Design a protein around this ligand. Structure first.
Ligand SMILES: Cc1cc2nc3c(=O)[nH]c(=O)nc-3n(C[C@H](O)[C@H](O)[C@H](O)COP(=O)(O)O)c2cc1C
Ligand code: SF4
Ligand code: SF4
Ligand code: SF4
Ligand code: SF4
Ligand code: SF4
Ligand code: FES
Ligand code: FES
Ligand SMILES: [Zn+2]
Lengths: 63, 71, 88, 111, 429, 110, 219, 251
């Protein structure tokens, strides 16, 4: 209320600028050679969701 | 009036210009007034501070009300 | 992102973003081939074309930009492959 | 790309003006410059006689200003030449940043 | 060492209290105009060098090292006749040390005009008397007519080959016009609105011609600095700060007086010795504004052992301005006093720049609320932040001079402000 | 309904904020310095048919000049009547002021 | 104090106004100080001279005459006349007692000085008395600070001749009312410290520093 | 790493006029060197760098002023935010226009300007086209702590062209400079000091000068507005055509 400094509170404009840098063939062949192996944890995790029958057990039917 | 003759074709109910030019100017103490609106600062216009240095009444632009110095 | 390492570099031709939803602005020729990838792939399984958003930039040379959204119900991620094709 | 664009014939013989809107003289701020806009003259606007409001007949009334703004005279000219309009590009008049300093207000008028 | 003791033969401003004749036949007896012909003949570079060697700092609020300031003036004259505006105008609250040089030995001020003029290659001196000093500028015009009739000033500087004439301008009641970059304009005829610093007065000041604005006390000790020893002058005060400031013990002292005394003097020693003592004893002291009004307070717990020199008072989170020490005892409403100071800075603010023009009326409104207690405990942090919004941004240091009293009041007597606010709260409900 | 100040004088100073905020561009406002000198709208015509009743005009208006009266019962036999004229039919809010002033006095807390 | 002009029969740009004799010479001298051009520099002294000549206030005709004498557009003279505080633009009577009001006076009873002076005279703050003689006007720091409470009179009775801007300092309510009565009786009270036992700007018990006879120090 | 920096062309395509290609001073605007001729104020050294520094009284045609401090960029080694409008670019000077000190200085000043300023934006003729509104909505703070009695000023009669509401006017002095310099008639003035500052003729004096209707475009605030265009329209309704004029042969 009495501390109206804005640039700290700002959200619209208080963001890092877009860093659009070009990759040339050298960079990507370097990256492909650097990627030696796809060990586990270099793989996207699965969104695990199984179904399970439940009648009214959550809270006892009372929420 | 003539401006008020553009939107009002009734010409029997008093034109708003006259309804505001017939209300007396409000005496006050200082050199600046508030005129927040009718009475409730949230149901009137944005508060408009008027200067009363002149002798003639200084109208509030938003509400037409008039204020005089009352020294 | 895993998807950029495996993907043939040529397929993500022009651009690539890294926030507000990641995108692979590709070329129109490699598009359905790129859409063949990210689907029918074990570690990138989208299977769900959410949306195909035409976007028109008159000041570009390739006016339109056919923004293919893609959801991955398996890995719970969303990729936005784009293109660029003018009026003809 | 004028014929495939579905625009009616009578609106592809239109004469446009590819200007760059000058800065609004009232406000000294350049945040709306450099956005070249085609200007379909679209002068024909009468007054619908029932109510006081106006009433255009040209389809290209507003889109010249609204939502159709390029970023360079080359892109705007390429656009107005694809569609087959007779564009007359009106160059933007830009300001000279003439050198000026504070200490010139307190200049000495010799004697 | 241990400073403070200045013997009556070491006070530069003799006839301060107007006991003896101020004009000629009364000034030559006090050594004024003694051998200025030799000094002018000793040259300009020698004068600047001896002023720098004497370590004389600015007697005015700026505190800049004089002499070094006089070396800023151009050496080769490119057609612009270098001027010398003397800042006689003070208008700082508390400051009468100028009022005792314009009258009561003004010939020191005129001889200083001449010696600094030959010092900084000047060609005319415009003693900008404060507007209200009507009797003072009448005495000074009398002494100027004298020094003109005695061949001291005008077409030959005291018989020497230097053409130097002193003209006496006088403003009209404006503390703002007193500023260095605003003196030049208020004297140029325009309003007393400061100019921005990128054109410095030494480069393009009065009439665009180069000039340096000097307070009367700095320009007026210049003669006796040169005639006596620059080593003798620098033998007073601490290492950097050196000289004999002319103080003005202003308020709430049982014997208020302006008295010349060595710099680096303990503030308590000055109070207890010369002006008597803080009304009701030193234990009755509440706060002290050590400089003029452009300086934060001293809450009496760092006022016992603080020295009235630029460096120490700057190190105590305050400033030594015109050294117009304003003393306030436990009986005053210190928040009301600082509210009246902020009202002063609201009144005497030429309004040229937005941070001061508006924020000073704002500071006055917040102070006239907090002196009753109408504020909220977080406004004391708005007031600090408002002052820090005013401080660095204004054209001249008046923005500072208006943010500093309130900043010091907050920093020191925040307990008292908070107490007034809480007492207002409990008064309600 | 275009509100009025208790002492006559249409509350609608012609800022054109509601004409700007209107999503459907229903409100057409033309302004003229009246002889009294205080700005007012020579033409304040809301086109109710071209209007989405979203209350943006009530929010955007600075002085609460335009408000939506709880009427909602104004089905008109002919379309031309449904176009609410320049400050004459929206000036019928004076009848609805007794309810509009109540709703505003109770909503202004939000 | 308005920062603009409201015409009046006493004060309007129609009225002819020009520096009287015994003041044209002062005008010529004041203009002689400053160079041929840049004579605008002399707007403060010329305006103060016009204020002294017209009995204490600056009519618009006076500012126009100063502008003609000084050769700038009258707006620049108007700008300087409204800026500087000493220039009264409405009549302040014959004396215009200026009582300082800054902190070094406020803490030393200057509010009581002003209140006593006001209730004795009977004017709000700056209104001129029905007698047309006196008027009170607050002024910021007047320099007279160690002389703790002060009151400056601006004798506008004669005009540019008997114009005395006296400093009555170290005053008290009784001293102030005495000064005002002795002023309305015609005579000129002795200015300076209204409190003996102290020399001007002195330590109130006899000065403690400047005692030895002045003499040329060892140069 | 093979980045793509934006072009960073001047602020409005402003042609930069070197008096000679030798005295080009090189200053750093946000760590991006720009070559500006000798004598360019920091504001122009930034308008060469595409950085648009918010200015209230600095007009390129008019003289340079410090009547407000809305620009206050922070140069590298100065103790206080320098007003960009008057600080001449020195070679090697590092201008940081968006550093927290610069942004806090801008917010500070835009609070002072909106402090004694009346809430006339709805009834202000220049409501949409306003430097004060568009600098508050872009560089000034989102909230105002001033809750007291704003100062108010009577409306001066400046003729049948310039409607004047000096309460809105921020006393940036731009018009009193335009009438003294470009219009050259010298009728407007900054009468008084402090917040009591009032812009206009001290005696009722219609601006007899032609070319003095442009003070409205000069004015960064509604205060000075076209009385003929009293309120008839808004900054957004007006469809603009870049036509020419035929009244006088200057074209
Ligand atoms: C806020 C402020 C207050 C000032 N007060 C005074 C003053 O009381 N007396 C004075 O002679 N000059 C005053 N000046 C002007 C200069 O700061 C400085 O005192 C003068 O130009 C040169 O004095 P010096 O040579 O002793 O440093 C003031 C300037 C500012 C910005
Ligand atoms: S507003 Fe303050 S800093 Fe700016 S010129 Fe006036 S007194 Fe100086
Ligand atoms: S509710 Fe109001 S703003 Fe919205 S469309 Fe209807 S008239 Fe326009
Ligand atoms: S109804 Fe509200 S927004 Fe529309 S013109 Fe009137 S005051 Fe402005
Ligand atoms: S100039 Fe007018 S529109 Fe702009 S902020 Fe001030 S009152 Fe509002
Ligand atoms: S009237 Fe307009 S141009 Fe003149 S000072 Fe005020 S805001 Fe600036
Ligand atoms: S207190 Fe400052 S002069 Fe009287
Ligand atoms: S416009 Fe450059 S600081 Fe005021
Ligand atoms: Zn109102």
């Amino acid at each position: 209320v009495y501390n109206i400094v804005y640039h700290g509170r700002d959200q619209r404009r208080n963001r890092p600028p877009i860093r659009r840098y070009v990759l040339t063939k050298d960079n990507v062949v370097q990256m492909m050679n650097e990627k030696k192996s796809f060990d586990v944890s270099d793989f996207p995790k699965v969104y695990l969701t199984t179904v399970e029958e439940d009648l009214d057990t959550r809270g006892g039917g009372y929420e | 009036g003539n401006h008020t003759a553009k939107w009002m074709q009734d010409r029997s109910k008093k034109s708003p210009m006259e309804l505001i030019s017939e209300v007396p100017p409000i005496k006050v103490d200082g050199r600046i007034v508030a005129c927040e609106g009718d009475t409730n600062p949230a149901l009137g216009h944005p508060i408009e501070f008027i200067c009363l240095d002149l002798n003639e009444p200084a109208i509030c632009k938003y509400c037409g009300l008039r204020y005089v110095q009352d020294h | 992102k895993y998807s950029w390492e495996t993907l043939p570099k040529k397929w993500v031709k022009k651009m690539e973003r890294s926030e507000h939803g990641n995108r692979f602005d590709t070329n129109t020729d490699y598009l359905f081939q790129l859409l063949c990838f990210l689907k029918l792939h074990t570690y990138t399984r989208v299977q769900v074309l959410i949306d195909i958003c035409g976007v028109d930039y008159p000041s570009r040379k390739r006016r339109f930009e056919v923004v293919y959204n893609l959801l991955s119900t398996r890995y719970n991620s969303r990729i936005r492959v784009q293109t660029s094709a003018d009026e003809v | 790309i004028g014929k495939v664009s579905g625009i009616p014939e009578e609106h592809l013989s239109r004469k446009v003006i590819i200007y760059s809107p000058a800065r609004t003289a009232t406000q000294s701020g350049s945040g709306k410059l450099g956005k070249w806009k085609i200007n379909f003259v679209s002068t024909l606007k009468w007054e619908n006689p029932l109510m006081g409001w106006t009433s255009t007949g040209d389809p290209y009334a507003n889109v010249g200003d609204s939502a159709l703004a390029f970023d360079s005279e080359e892109a705007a000219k390429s656009f107005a030449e694809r569609h087959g309009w007779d564009y007359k590009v009106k160059k933007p008049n830009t300001p000279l940043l003439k050198v000026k300093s504070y200490s010139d207000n307190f200049k000495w008028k010799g004697n | 060492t241990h400073f403070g003791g200045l013997k009556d033969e070491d006070r530069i401003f003799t006839n301060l209290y107007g006991l003896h004749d101020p004009f000629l036949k009364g000034a030559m007896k006090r050594g004024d105009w003694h051998r200025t012909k030799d000094l002018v003949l000793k040259g300009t570079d020698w004068i600047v060098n001896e002023m720098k060697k004497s370590g004389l700092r600015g007697r005015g609020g700026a505190g800049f090292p004089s002499g070094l300031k006089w070396s800023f003036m151009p050496k080769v004259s490119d057609g612009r006749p270098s001027y010398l505006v003397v800042n006689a105008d003070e208008s700082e609250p508390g400051t009468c040390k100028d009022r005792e040089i314009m009258r009561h030995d003004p010939h020191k001020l005129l001889e200083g005009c001449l010696i600094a003029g030959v010092g900084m290659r000047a060609s005319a001196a415009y003693i900008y008397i404060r507007g209200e000093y009507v009797n003072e500028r009448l005495n000074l015009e009398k002494a100027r007519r004298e020094a003109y009739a005695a061949g001291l000033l005008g077409k030959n500087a005291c018989g020497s080959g230097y053409d130097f004439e002193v003209y006496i301008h006088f403003g009209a009641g404006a503390y703002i016009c007193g500023e260095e970059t605003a003196l030049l304009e208020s004297l140029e005829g325009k309003q007393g609105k400061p100019r921005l610093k990128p054109p410095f007065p030494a480069n393009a000041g009065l009439y665009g011609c180069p000039t340096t604005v000097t307070n009367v006390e700095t320009v007026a000790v210049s003669p006796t600095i040169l005639r006596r020893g620059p080593e003798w002058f620098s033998s007073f005060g601490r290492k950097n700060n050196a000289g004999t400031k002319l103080f003005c013990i202003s308020g709430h002292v049982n014997k208020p007086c302006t008295v010349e005394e060595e710099m680096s003097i303990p503030l308590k020693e000055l109070i207890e010795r010369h002006c008597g003592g803080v009304r009701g004893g030193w234990d009755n002291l509440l706060a002290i504004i050590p400089g003029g009004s452009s300086v934060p307070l001293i809450p009496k717990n760092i006022c016992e052992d603080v020295l009235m020199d630029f460096d120490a008072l700057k190190a105590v989170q305050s400033g030594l301005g015109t050294a117009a020490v304003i003393v306030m005892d436990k009986s005053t409403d210190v928040v009301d006093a600082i509210a009246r100071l902020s009202y002063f800075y609201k009144h005497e603010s030429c309004g040229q720049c937005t941070p001061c023009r508006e924020g000073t009326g704002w500071l006055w409104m917040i102070m006239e609320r907090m002196k009753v207690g109408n504020a909220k405990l977080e406004e004391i942090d708005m007031l600090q932040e408002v002052t820090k919004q005013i401080e660095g941004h204004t054209i001249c240091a008046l923005g500072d001079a208006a943010a500093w009293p309130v900043q010091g009041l907050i920093r020191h007597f925040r307990p008292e402000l908070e107490r007034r606010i809480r007492e207002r709260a409990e008064r309600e409900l | 309904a275009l509100r009025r100040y208790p002492t006559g004088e249409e509350r609608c100073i012609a800022c054109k904020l509601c004409e700007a905020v209107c999503p459907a561009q229903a409100i057409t406002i033309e302004a003229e310095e009246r002889e009294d000198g205080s700005r007012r709208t020579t033409r304040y015509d809301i086109d109710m048919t071209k209007c989405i009743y979203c209350g943006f005009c009530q929010e955007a208006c600075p002085v609460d000049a335009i408000v939506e009266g709880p009427n909602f019962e104004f089905a008109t036999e002919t379309h031309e009547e449904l176009l609410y004229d320049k400050e004459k039919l929206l000036e019928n809010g004076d009848r609805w002021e007794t309810e509009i002033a109540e709703n505003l006095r109770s909503e202004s807390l939000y | 104090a308005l920062n603009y002009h409201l015409d009046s029969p006493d004060n309007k740009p129609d009225l002819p106004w020009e520096f009287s004799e015994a003041n044209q010479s002062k005008v010529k001298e004041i203009l002689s100080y400053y160079p041929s051009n840049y004579k605008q520099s002399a707007v403060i002294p010329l305006l103060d001279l016009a204020q002294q000549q017209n009995g204490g206030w600056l009519p618009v005709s006076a500012m126009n005459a100063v502008a003609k004498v000084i050769e700038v557009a009258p707006i620049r003279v108007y700008e300087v006349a409204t800026f500087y505080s000493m220039f009264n633009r409405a009549k302040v009577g014959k004396y215009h007692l200026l009582v300082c009001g800054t902190t070094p006076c406020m803490i030393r009873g200057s509010r009581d000085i002003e209140s006593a002076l006001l209730d004795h005279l009977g004017v709000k703050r700056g209104e001129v008395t029905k007698d047309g003689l006196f008027s009170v006007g607050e002024m910021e720091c007047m320099g007279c600070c160690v002389n703790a409470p002060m009151i400056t009179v601006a004798d506008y009775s004669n005009g540019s001749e008997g114009y005395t801007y006296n400093y009555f300092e170290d005053v008290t309510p009784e001293k102030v009312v005495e000064i005002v009565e002795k002023l309305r009786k015609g005579e000129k009270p002795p200015h300076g410290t209204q409190n003996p036992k102290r020399i001007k700007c002195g330590p109130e018990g006899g000065n403690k520093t400047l005692l030895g006879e002045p003499k040329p120090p060892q140069f | 790493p093979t980045q793509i920096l934006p072009p960073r062309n001047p602020v409005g395509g402003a042609r930069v006029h070197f008096s000679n290609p030798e005295d080009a001073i090189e200053v750093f605007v946000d760590g991006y060197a720009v070559k500006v001729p000798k004598g360019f104020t920091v504001l122009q050294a930034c308008e060469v760098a595409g950085v648009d520094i918010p200015r209230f009284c600095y007009h390129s045609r008019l003289s340079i002023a410090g009547n407000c401090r809305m620009c206050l960029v922070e140069v590298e080694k100065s103790p206080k935010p320098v007003a960009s409008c008057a600080m001449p670019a020195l070679p090697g000077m590092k201008i940081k226009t968006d550093t927290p000190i610069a942004k806090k200085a801008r917010e500070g000043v835009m609070e002072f300007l909106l402090m004694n300023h009346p809430l006339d934006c709805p009834i202000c003729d220049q409501g949409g086209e306003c430097d004060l509104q568009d600098q508050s909505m872009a560089f000034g703070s989102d909230r105002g702590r001033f809750t007291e009695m704003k100062r108010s000023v009577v409306d001066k009669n400046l003729g049948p062209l310039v409607k004047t509401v000096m309460t809105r006017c921020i006393q940036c002095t731009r018009c009193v400079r335009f009438a003294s310099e470009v219009a050259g008639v010298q009728d407007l003035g900054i009468l008084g000091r402090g917040s009591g500052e009032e812009i206009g003729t001290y005696v009722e004096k219609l601006m007899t000068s032609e070319l003095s209707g442009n003070v409205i475009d000069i004015c960064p605030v509604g205060a000075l507005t076209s009385k003929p265009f009293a309120f008839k329209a808004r900054n957004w309704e007006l469809k603009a055509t870049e036509t020419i004029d035929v009244s006088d042969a200057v074209g």
